[PDB]
Amino acid sequence: DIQMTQSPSSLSASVGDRVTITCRASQSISSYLNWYQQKPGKAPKLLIYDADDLQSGVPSRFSGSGSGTDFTLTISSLQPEDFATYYCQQSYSTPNTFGQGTKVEIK
């Protein structure tokens, strides 16, 4: 089992702001780290995989960084469609496990 710790739990930002979210894995997962976005009532959608491989058709304002145990998701310039809960998920080991999520909330 691998435990994923996300920080912060929630944050406040306005449209246009840059936001950073962190994810720590309990042991190394090299670059097998995925970022998901979830809107309330809806399923999680994959934004980044392989730690920093932005999925085709996902906007460039989303970027991932990190390798090993420490990962970051940066949203460089928030659009209103970006307010959501973001999860990291390790895909190194089964069961794949999610962080607790960070809610990015409108200010």
* CATH at residue 19: 2.60.40.10
C-alpha to C-alpha distance for 55 and 80, rounded to whole angstroms = 20
Q: How far apart are CA 106 and CA 99, in angstroms?
A: 21
Sign for the pseudo-dihedral over CA of 6, 40, 33, 93: positive
Q: Are 67 and 3 in contact (CB under 8 A)?
A: no
31, 88 contact by CB (below 8 A): no
Burial class (CB in 10 A: 0-12, 13-18, 19+), 47: buried
Distance CA 79, CA 93 (A): 33
Quoted resolution (Å): 1.8
Dihedral sign of CA atoms 77, 45, 94, 100 in order: positive
CB atoms near residue 58 (< 10 Å): 16
Q: What is the DSSP letter of 82?
A: G
How far apart (Å, rounded) are the C-alpha atoms in residues 32 and 69?
Answer: 10
Count structural domains, the chain: 1
Structure tokens at 64: 């991932």
Cα 59 to chain center, whole Å?
A: 14
Within 10 Å of residue 72's Cβ, how many Cβ atoms?
A: 16
Alpha-carbon gap, residue 69 to 63, rounded angstroms: 17
- Tell me the three state secondary structure of residue 80: helix
- Strand runs labelled E in 1-107: 4-7, 10-13, 19-25, 33-38, 45-49, 53-54, 62-67, 70-75, 84-90, 97-98, 102-106
Range of the domain at 74: 1-107
